[PDB]
Amino acid sequence: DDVVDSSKSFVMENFSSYHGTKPGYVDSIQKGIQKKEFYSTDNKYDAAGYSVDNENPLSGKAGGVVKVTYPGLTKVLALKVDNAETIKKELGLSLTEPLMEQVGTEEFIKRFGDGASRVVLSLPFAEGSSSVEYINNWEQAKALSVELEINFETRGKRGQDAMYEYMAQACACINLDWDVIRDKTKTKIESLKEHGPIKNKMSESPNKTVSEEKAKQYLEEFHQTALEHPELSELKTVTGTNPVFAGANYAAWAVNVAQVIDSETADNLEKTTAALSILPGIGSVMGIADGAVHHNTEEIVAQSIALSSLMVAQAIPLVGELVGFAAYNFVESIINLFQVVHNSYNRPAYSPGHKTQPFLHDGYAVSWNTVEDSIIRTGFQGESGHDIKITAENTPLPIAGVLLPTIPGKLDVNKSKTHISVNGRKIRMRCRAIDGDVTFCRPKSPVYVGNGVHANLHVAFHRSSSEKIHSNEISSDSIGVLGYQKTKVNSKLSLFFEIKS
Amino acid sequence: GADDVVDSSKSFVMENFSSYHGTKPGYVDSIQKGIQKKEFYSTDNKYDAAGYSVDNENPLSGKAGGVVKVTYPGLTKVLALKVDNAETIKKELGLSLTEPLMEQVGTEEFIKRFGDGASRVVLSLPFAEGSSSVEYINNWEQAKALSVELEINFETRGKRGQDAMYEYMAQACASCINLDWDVIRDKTKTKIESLKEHGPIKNKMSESPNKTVSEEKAKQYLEEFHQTALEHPELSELKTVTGTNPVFAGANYAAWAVNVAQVIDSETADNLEKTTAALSILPGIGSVMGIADGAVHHNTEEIVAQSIALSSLMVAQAIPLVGEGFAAYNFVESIINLFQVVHNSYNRPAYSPGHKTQPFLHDGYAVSWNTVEDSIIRTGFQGESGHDIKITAENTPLPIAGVLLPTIPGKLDVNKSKTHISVNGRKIRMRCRAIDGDVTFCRPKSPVYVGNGVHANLHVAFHRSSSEKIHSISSDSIGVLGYQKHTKVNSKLSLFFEIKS
Ligand SMILES: NC(=O)c1cccnc1
Numbered sequence A: 001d002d003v004v005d006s007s008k009s010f011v012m013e014n015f016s017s018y019h020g021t022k023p024g025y026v027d028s029i030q031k032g033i034q035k036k037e038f039y040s041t042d043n044k045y046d047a048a049g050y051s052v053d054n055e056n057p058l059s060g061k062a063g064g065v066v067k068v069t070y071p072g073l074t075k076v077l078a079l080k081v082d083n084a085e086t087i088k089k090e091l092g093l094s095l096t097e098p099l100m101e102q103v104g105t106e107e108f109i110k111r112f113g114d115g116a117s118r119v120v121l122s123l124p125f126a127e128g129s130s131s132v133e134y135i136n137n138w139e140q141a142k143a144l145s146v147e148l149e150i151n152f153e154t155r156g157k158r159g160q161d162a163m164y165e166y167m168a169q170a171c172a173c174i175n176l177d178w179d180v181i182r183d184k185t186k187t188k189i190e191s192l193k194e195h196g197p198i199k200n201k202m203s204e205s206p207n208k209t210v211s212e213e214k215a216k217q218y219l220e221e222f223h224q225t226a227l228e229h230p231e232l233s234e235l236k237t238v239t240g241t242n243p244v245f246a247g248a249n250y251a252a253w254a255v256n257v258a259q260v261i262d263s264e265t266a267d268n269l270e271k272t273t274a275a276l277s278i279l280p281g282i283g284s285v286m287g288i289a290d291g292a293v294h295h296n297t298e299e300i301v302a303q304s305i306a307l308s309s310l311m312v313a314q315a316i317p318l319v320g321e322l323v324g325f326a327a328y329n330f331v332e333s334i335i336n337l338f339q340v341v342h343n344s345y346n347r348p349a350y351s352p353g354h355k356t357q358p359f360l361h362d363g364y365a366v367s368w369n370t371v372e373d374s375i376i377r378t379g380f381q382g383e384s385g386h387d388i389k390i391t392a393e394n395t396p397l398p399i400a401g402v403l404l405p406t407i408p409g410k411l412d413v414n415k416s417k418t419h420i421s422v423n424g425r426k427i428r429m430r431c432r433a434i435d436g437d438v439t440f441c442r443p444k445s446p447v448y449v450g451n452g453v454h455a456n457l458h459v460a461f462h463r464s465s466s467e468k469i470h471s472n473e474i475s476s477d478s479i480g481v482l483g484y485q486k487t488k489v490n491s492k493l494s495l496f497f498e499i500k501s
Numbered sequence B: 001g002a003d004d005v006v007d008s009s010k011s012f013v014m015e016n017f018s019s020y021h022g023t024k025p026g027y028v029d030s031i032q033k034g035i036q037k038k039e040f041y042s043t044d045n046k047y048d049a050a051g052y053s054v055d056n057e058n059p060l061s062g063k064a065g066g067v068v069k070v071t072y073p074g075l076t077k078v079l080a081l082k083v084d085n086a087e088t089i090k091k092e093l094g095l096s097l098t099e100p101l102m103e104q105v106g107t108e109e110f111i112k113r114f115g116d117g118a119s120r121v122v123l124s125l126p127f128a129e130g131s132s133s134v135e136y137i138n139n140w141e142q143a144k145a146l147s148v149e150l151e152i153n154f155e156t157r158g159k160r161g162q163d164a165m166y167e168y169m170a171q172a173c174a175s176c177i178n179l180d181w182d183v184i185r186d187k188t189k190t191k192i193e194s195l196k197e198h199g200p201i202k203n204k205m206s207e208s209p210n211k212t213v214s215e216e217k218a219k220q221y222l223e224e225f226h227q228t229a230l231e232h233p234e235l236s237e238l239k240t241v242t243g244t245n246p247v248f249a250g251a252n253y254a255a256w257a258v259n260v261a262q263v264i265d266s267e268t269a270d271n272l273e274k275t276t277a278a279l280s281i282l283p284g285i286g287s288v289m290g291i292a293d294g295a296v297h298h299n300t301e302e303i304v305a306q307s308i309a310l311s312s313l314m315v316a317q318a319i320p321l322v323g324e325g326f327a328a329y330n331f332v333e334s335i336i337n338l339f340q341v342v343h344n345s346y347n348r349p350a351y352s353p354g355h356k357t358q359p360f361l362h363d364g365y366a367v368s369w370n371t372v373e374d375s376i377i378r379t380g381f382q383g384e385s386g387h388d389i390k391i392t393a394e395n396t397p398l399p400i401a402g403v404l405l406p407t408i409p410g411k412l413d414v415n416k417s418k419t420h421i422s423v424n425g426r427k428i429r430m431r432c433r434a435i436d437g438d439v440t441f442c443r444p445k446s447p448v449y450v451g452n453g454v455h456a457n458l459h460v461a462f463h464r465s466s467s468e469k470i471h472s473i474s475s476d477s478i479g480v481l482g483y484q485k486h487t488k489v490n491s492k493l494s495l496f497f498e499i500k501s
């Protein structure tokens, strides 16, 4: 009875999976799997993320990854739910005994093993992940042979560099040499601290608790002065245009750090990371904005970190409780946060306006209602409807209309089924072709969205031809929802679609 | 088959089945003599029908016809459909895939197969997303048997603009914005006349460049004009209610005023429909309407007339300073219509941010229950449930510090091992501890950041050791904590749930 996905289940000889292991168990675990649940994964880089010292999960040492292999035949049973009660129930299992202890018995292995020596349960690893998680019964797991994939400690590297440089292999991609960056950062911090112009600005410092608005002003001056050093010249150029990367934001960052780091915290890397990790504005130092990692060479990353460090040094006497943190634990900790965020951007992910990820802009939030909505099926005659959610954060903002791609016969707008519903008020639309690759639909009643007022734009397409829409044929890959008017232009809210079938 | 397109449970046979039809001006008398002609449309909701009665040539601001009640004699079958797709429906219902659906629906054959003894079949579809109304689709031939009665003629009410239509709709909600627009019109004109004579005001006017000037200089003048203007006795109340909320400050009135002058040329000024089109796509209207944070604050006839009277005066002053009479004529007429539109939205039942799948938008974050079912915590059974919350942010990396989960002794506990947060697919386990007041605090074991292109799925797992139904918890919300910002607090992102079963 179906809590079990047949199509993703199978039997396999020498079935292997991966298990991330904490420091102090790497050698130990190779001697065999001892305790039901023992977890493994088909993805060794995801395995790696489980290797960090449990006493210091944010910043601790990473242990390693092992490959575990069942000799003989192994049944991998893929499940559609992770609800043990449903599972115990739709498989005629005993609803009293645990699930995993049951999958280890011969009775269960007989009925679901298909001839295999044990069953291993399979689940989706995580939302937004295509990896797989295996749940193994402890008894059956004593059969596994264990082999070393990598020990991060034998690597001899600082912080969690070995773990992150490993994961970064998944994408062959931000693949930085953190050893190079560490040394360059150290060098630049030292060089900065000697510079005549900078030592001077420093002496212009009130060197005592001042108001936040004042410390910021000084730090903006320090930043401007420091950014003229030859060692930060590349950084001067790359931070030159984007508002996120401006001195004011470095200043706000330094001030913020100074405010939260006490002595107890300063003196411990785990506690320092915990405290830094919850601050806003880190994107300014990382050079991360608009969905891209701009600071993506060792040289530029090290410059930004050096600058930030000198600035945290300045802000401490100004707003800090600290009577060297800036050059020690602050550097070590921020390096960790760079690596966490870089790893995120390295992972396959849907961009705003793709699938059901919201597109967030000018106060609006819009999204395809479901994944299927974001798909425009082709190669048949007939209708399809596509729902887009629209709201705004606070005050009422208008929706002027919507730009829809068109192809004669293959994709026309159905003028009478296309509409926009505002808190249930159905508002028909007036659509007129422009380009002939684009139709513009305006609502026949004013549309506003805001806190408490949401809309569902329902796009209806009609296909007179059975011919498939081809690769180089669609003028755009997005639908353009137009917000308020602001040369006069409209706030542009994009939902990206895919042509399938 | 048929079960795959017809909703058996929501279908019925009814005697003297009635529905409503919105009729355009000029047809309110002619329609009462019978329904004649691809489909005839009606609805179970007479206020929704009202929305369809506006002059097609002037959709935005034209005259409203009326509403009629149409009744079939004897027995009628209402056939509720699960899909609105003609092809799917003709197929699964084994119809002629070549003829129009509604043509076939009106034949003897079809009526015998699906009418259950009724004299005809009417099709039923959800009226719209976010609405609980129903849309009826009627065959033209069969529609001939309909007797037609007047429900309301909006023209006999002989009121100005669309007042009669909107005042009728507001009856849906007996809370409810139910304004007398006749009084607002009278009060408005009366105050525009009073303000325009005032010594201090008339003065302030002659102090104006009365010529094309930059935007920053017109804004300054209008802000000044605003403050002077606000001290008039007749705008006394307005003075108090716009005192504290920054949305309502003079700066925003001037921004609005300047916006209106910039976009209204002579052609537009001379036409109400064109004026409403131009006005409807401007940002900032919440400043005039007094609408913010999910509430309509300007909800008395007096206070609305004051706000409108002020904006008009201000647009009048902005026109010589940044533009190309209209200020007291069409601008008033048009903005009145827009108030009525947004008011009607707020009167309509809708989900507030963070309820069901409506997103909660705050401090750069967007969070939402992933599906409706996630937002429900089922009760009255022992065992597990899981709850998915989408989390992202608009631009730079912003942290998620943790989550606050409501609990109940032995009725609802947090399953610590299943609860986790996945960041672009990286599954991050959580450290959860019960704190004071029946709340469990769970913080991630690796730092979490979200931003453009980085999203998370927070997966909350509850466990119930008792089968005792949960009776009327401390909170009705889950508190996702953002970045840390008197005292140190975290950004609060609330997801609201319902207890059912
Ligand atoms: N220790 C692990 O590698 C692991 C894999 C999957 C789920 N949980 C833990």
Ligand SMILES: NC(=O)c1cccnc1
Pocket (backbone or CB within 6 Å): B020, B021, B022, B023, B041, B042, B043, B048, B049, B050, B052, B135, B136
């Ligand atoms: N004119 C109408 O009342 C109407 C009802 C439902 C749908 N479309 C039009």
